[PDB]
Amino acid sequence: QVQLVQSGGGVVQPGRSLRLSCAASGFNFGDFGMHWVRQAPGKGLEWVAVISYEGRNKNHADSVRGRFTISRDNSRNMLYLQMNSLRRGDTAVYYCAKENRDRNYDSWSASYSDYYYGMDVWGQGTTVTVSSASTKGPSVFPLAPSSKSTSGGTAALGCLVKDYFPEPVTVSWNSGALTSGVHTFPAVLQSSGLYSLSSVVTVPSSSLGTQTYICNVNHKPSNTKVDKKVEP
Amino acid sequence: ADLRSNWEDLLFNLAQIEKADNAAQVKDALTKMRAAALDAQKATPPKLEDKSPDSPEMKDFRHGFDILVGQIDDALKLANEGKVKEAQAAAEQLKTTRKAYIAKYLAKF
Amino acid sequence: DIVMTQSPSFLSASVGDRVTITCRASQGIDRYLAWYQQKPGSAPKLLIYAASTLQSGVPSRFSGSGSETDFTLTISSLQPDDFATYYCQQLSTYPTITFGQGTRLEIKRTVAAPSVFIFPPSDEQLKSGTASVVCLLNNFYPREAKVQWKVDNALQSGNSQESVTEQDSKDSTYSLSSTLTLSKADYEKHKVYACEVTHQGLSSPVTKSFNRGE
């Protein structure tokens, strides 16, 4: 199986450094150029760097040149991205990717077969978060079913999961049993450097007196669990 | 050197020339292109192994590298005179020359 | 570096539609252009390279064309698997590579009005120095929705952060949360706080609002 398995990454503070790794298997690693590509939260793909089959020639995007260094070790089927002087703008998922060879060509034929034909095999991605924030568990406040959270037939209620770092949190409602009509929103990064999100559910006006609704929040990076029940 | 390594020296060093902001970078890149071109000129590309050295294709292959080296040397002389942007402009034709004179001889067989 | 401009950025279609996405290069790139598909949470997938060559395993309903500076990707008849974001990528300047900004293809359905709810700050949060008001817009379509916060009929910006779900698995609708943050010194400086919502499916903008002590 032709495949790339990435490792490394995580939370790192600004100005410090990190090394990403990408282990290749199932093909002749040292016959192909290799690339790094990144994707910031909510944005498009951005090309980062490339290295020749041999490791002798390389190139980096203007936005990382002088700080990031691509390298490879063919005898261990390993591709590396050394990232120094990290900036908050480097927060992204990073993908390694193998250069595609045009299918009419079994072996290298310069520009007829290589370089110009995209990237066919991609790693699964590594998240890098550049932040000065420290690990903090969330605060969980209710979004109580008001008389203005009304439809005359269905009520809406939720939980506000405020001020945590890093991603992710997990939200359930009464421990897995309520799953219809649930909306947990993507977290937003506050100017504080901490995230926050809301989870909501719409329920019949019938059940505001006959069934209990608790949201179970879990933030594993802080080992904090909160089960906060939501009623008028 | 391997023919692929020499080919890739001409490809990757053009980017180093285009992004340079001082003469040293341009001359370093042009100097590597020159050595790659002279080394590849000595090689027998795989599609030409059936051919005599006096065949039109072998002569065409060898002399296409002469065109490239001549153009590399014109850019190099400007870079040695500290004319970075003139040297960068003169280096733009190297890709045209590489495609028009050399590429076809690297097809497999 | 070469700039790739994809158009449109967002488009809606239904299963069985014929769909065309364009990419435009700031200068000629011959045919050295590739197309990718990406779904959230997964790596890009190469669909097409050399502008018109179909990568192996990619269904034949995908096709590409174009030369020099204008390129399109076509899906002859959509399948549910094809709703995704699509990126072009130029490689003519190799080893300098640049991507287009992407085109998101979404499922079209009928106009659905948002059911709008507002929630007051719970006062466990009050005792900690800050107040957050949340407005919910549930199960609407299309995505375009304007949310404006009125505090005592004085409206704001630079103070509000919003978030949206992805198109729902079942009914293909969207939901949106708008959170307004204030220091609680300023939270009861003022009186009314309103969530005004503009949407295509609402005859006139809807505002559901609270007052301190609501």
Author numbering:
A (entry chain A): 1 to 52, 52A, 53 to 82, 82A, 82B, 82C, 83 to 100, 100A, ...
B (entry chain C): 2 to 110
C (entry chain B): 1 to 95, 95A, 96 to 213
Quote the original article.
To further confirm binding specificity and to validate the computational design process, a high resolution (2.2 Å) crystal structure of FP-15 in complex with DH1058 mAb was solved. The experimentally determined structure was in close agreement with that of the computationally generated antibody-ES complex, both overall and over the epitope scaffold only (backbone RMSD < 1 Å). FP-2, FP-10, and FP-15 bound to DH1058 with picomolar affinities and to DH1294 with KDs of 1221 nM, 0.1 nM and 219 nM respectively. To ensure that these affinity gains were primarily mediated by the grafted epitope residues and not by contacts between the scaffold and the antibody that are not present in the native DH1058-epitope complex, interface hotspot residues corresponding to SARS-CoV-2 spike amino acids R815, E819, and F823 were mutated to alanine in designs FP-2, FP-10, and FP-15. Two of the three substitutions similarly eliminated DH1058 binding to FP-15, with the F823A equivalent retaining some low-level antibody binding. Importantly, these interactions were mediated by the engineered epitope contacts, as binding to the parent scaffold of FP-15 that does not contain the grafted epitope, was significantly reduced (3.5 -fold in vaccinated, 2.5-fold in infected and 5.5-fold in hybrid).
Other regions in the spike S2 subunit, such as the stem helix and the segment encompassing residues 815-823 adjacent to the fusion peptide, are highly conserved across sarbecoviruses and are recognized by broadly reactive antibodies, providing hope that vaccines targeting these epitopes could offer protection against both current and emergent viruses. Here we employ computational modeling to design scaffolded immunogens that display the spike 815-823 peptide and the stem helix epitopes without the distracting and immunodominant receptor binding domain. Unlike peptide-based immunogens that can sample diverse epitope conformations, epitope scaffolds are meant to present only the antibody-bound conformation of the target epitope on their surface, which typically leads to higher antibody affinity and the elicitation of antibodies specific for the structure of the target epitope.
